[PDB]
From a paper:
In particular, several compounds possessing a dibenzothiazepinone scaffold exhibited low-micromolar IC50 values towards CaBdf1 BD1 and no or only weak inhibition of Brd4 BD1 at the highest concentration (20 μM) tested. One such inhibitor was compound 1. ITC measurements showed that 1 binds CaBdf1 BD1 with a Kd of 5 μM, consistent with the IC50 value (4.3 μM) determined by HTRF, whereas no or only modest binding and inhibition were detected for Brd4 BD1 and CaBdf1 BD2. Furthermore, a BROMOscan screen from DiscoverX revealed that compound 1 showed no significant activity against 32 representative human (BET and non-BET) BDs; indeed, an ITC experiment confirmed that the two human BDs (SMARCA2 and SMARCA4) with the strongest BROMOscan response did not detectably bind compound 1. To understand the molecular basis of selectivity we solved the crystal structure of CaBdf1 BD1 bound to 1. Compound 1 mimics the acetyllysine ligand by interacting with the conserved Tyr248 and Asn291 residues, forming direct and water-mediated hydrogen bonds via the thiazepinone carbonyl group. The dibenzothiazepinone ring system engages hydrophobic residues from the Val-Pro-Phe (VPF) shelf (Pro233), helix B (Phe290) and the ZZ′ loop (Val238, Leu243 and Val245), while the cyclopropyl group interacts with the VPF shelf (Pro233 and Phe234), helix B (Cys287) and the gatekeeper residue on helix C (Ile297). In contrast, the oxadiazole and pyrazine groups point away from the pocket, adopting different orientations in the four complexes present in the crystal's asymmetric unit. Superimposing the ligand-bound structure with that of Brd4 BD1 results in a steric overlap between the larger Brd4 side chains at signature positions 1 and 3 (Trp81 and Leu94) and the oxadiazole and distal benzene groups of compound 1, explaining why 1 fails to inhibit the human BD. Steric hindrance from the corresponding residues in CaBdf1 BD2 (Phe409 and Ile422) also account for this domain's insensitivity to compound 1.
BET proteins are chromatin-associated factors that regulate transcription and chromatin remodelling. BET proteins bind chromatin through their two BDs (BD1 and BD2), which specifically recognize histones acetylated on lysine residues. The BDs from C. albicans Bdf1 (CaBdf1) share 31–46% sequence identity with human BET BDs and 58–66% identity with those from ScBdf1 and hence are likely to bind multi-acetylated H3 and H4 tails. In conclusion, Bdf1 BDs are required for the viability and virulence of C. albicans and can be selectively targeted by small-molecule inhibitors without compromising human BET BD function.
Numbering used by the authors: 192 to 320
Write the structure that this text describes.
């Protein structure tokens, strides 16, 4: 099957102007809140295709994503905008639905934590200032 993509973030391609700290603190706390959701447990760590016996996972999913990667990218200043945090969360969810199917129980878990994430993000402070 397709090989495992490199871990994010690319430490040689970090942005010159990352998310401002007041937004970075908020999205970090937002991800940590989602990580405490019981529905988030299977999303805490990258898919391990050996443990799960899916040799063709990366053929479906060329850009895997998980909550720990989002947290790491926030901490390592890899994001330029909070829209990219939203994008990565949506990518994690879309990956799950693409590989497992929309009707799978794991995809309902993904939808549930996406709904929590979206509700929490209502209160993100604006970028300017
Ligand atoms: O995409 C998948 C995926 C990919 C291939 C096959 C199934 C799944 S579903 C899935 C399950 C897990 C998992 N972690 O632990 C256990 C477990 C299961 N029973 C007993 C003990 N532990 N399952 C982690 C990630 C995960 N995800 C990612 C969308 C989350
Ligand atoms: O038989 C199966 C089985 C049944 C159906 C589909 C796949 C598998 S393979 C399999 C994986 C898991 C699992 N535990 O943690 C994770 C994980 C994966 N990535 C990230 C984080 N965590 N996967 C547990 C039990 C397990 N087993 C039992 C033989 C062990
Ligand atoms: Ni292979
Ligand atoms: Ni704004």
């Amino acid at each position: 099957g397709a090989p495992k993509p490199p871990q994010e973030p690319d430490m040689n391609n970090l942005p010159e102007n990352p998310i401002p700290q007041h937004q970075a603190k908020f999205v970090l706390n937002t991800i940590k809140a989602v990580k405490r959701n019981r529905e988030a447990v299977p999303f805490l760590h990258p898919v391990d295709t050996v443990k799960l016996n899916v040799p063709f996972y990366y053929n479906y999913i060329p850009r895997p994503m998980d909550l720990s990667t989002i947290e790491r990218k926030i901490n390592l200043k890899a994001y330029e905008d909070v829209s990219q945090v939203v994008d990565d969360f949506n990518l994690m969810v879309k990956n799950c639905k693409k590989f497992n199917g929309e009707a799978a129980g794991i995809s309902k878990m993904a939808t549930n934590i996406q709904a929590q994430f979206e509700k929490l993000m209502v209160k993100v402070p604006p970028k300017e200032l």
